[PDB]
Amino acid sequence: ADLGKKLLEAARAGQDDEVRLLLEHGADVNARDSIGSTPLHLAAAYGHLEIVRLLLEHGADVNARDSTGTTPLHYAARLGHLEIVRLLLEHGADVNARDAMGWTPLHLAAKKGHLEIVRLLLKHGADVNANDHFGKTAFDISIDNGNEDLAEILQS
Numbered sequence: 001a002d003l004g005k006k007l008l009e010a011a012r013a014g015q016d017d018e019v020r021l022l023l024e025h026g027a028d029v030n031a032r033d034s035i036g037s038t039p040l041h042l043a044a045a046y047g048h049l050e051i052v053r054l055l056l057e058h059g060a061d062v063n064a065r066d067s068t069g070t071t072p073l074h075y076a077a078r079l080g081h082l083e084i085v086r087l088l089l090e091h092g093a094d095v096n097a098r099d100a101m102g103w104t105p106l107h108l109a110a111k112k113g114h115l116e117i118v119r120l121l122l123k124h125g126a127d128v129n130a131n132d133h134f135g136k137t138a139f140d141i142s143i144d145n146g147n148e149d150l151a152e153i154l155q156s
């Protein structure tokens with residue numbers, strides 16, 4: 001296989017030394033799979049913090065979008081990986097990126113009940129008044145979902 005297909009595979013699987021190698025030997029850091037996912041997307045999704053650091057150090061596009069408009073920060077926020085959320089934000093991730101449904105990382109964290117993530121996104125400039133395409137804010141999702149603590153952080 002092409003260096004980029006391997007990198008995607010390695011990233012998803014958490015193979016740190018294999019990702020480290022591929023990058024040192026010129027694999028496309030932003031290689032795309034069938035749905036537009038990059039290595040970064042996959043590492044952020046599957047919780048591979050070390051691979052996220054490696055990728056970012058080798059110039060990964062921190063704000064890459066897949067076919068659904070989903071960024072690595074959306075995945076890290078949705079799936080609860082607070083230390084990856086922190087790292088991505090420190091590397092210039094777009095805190096208010098909207099996916100195809102209009103959801104920001106904040107909306108995704110609110111949907112999934114991730115409080116410490118909500119608190120960290122709000123700390124780095126998340127737009128608490130952002131409406132998704134359904135016309136709802138992160139708060140409204142909290143109410144519908146039924147999350148008292150999160151409903152509460154969102155309205156301080």
Ligand SMILES: [Mg+2]
Pocket residue numbers: 062063064071072073074088093094
């Ligand atoms: Mg991002």
Ligand SMILES: [Mg+2]
Pocket residue numbers: 062063071072073074093094095096097
């Ligand atoms: Mg983003």
Ligand SMILES: [Mg+2]
Pocket residue numbers: 095096097104105106107121126127
């Ligand atoms: Mg946000």
Ligand SMILES: [Mg+2]
Pocket residue numbers: 095096104105106107126127128129130138
């Ligand atoms: Mg927001």
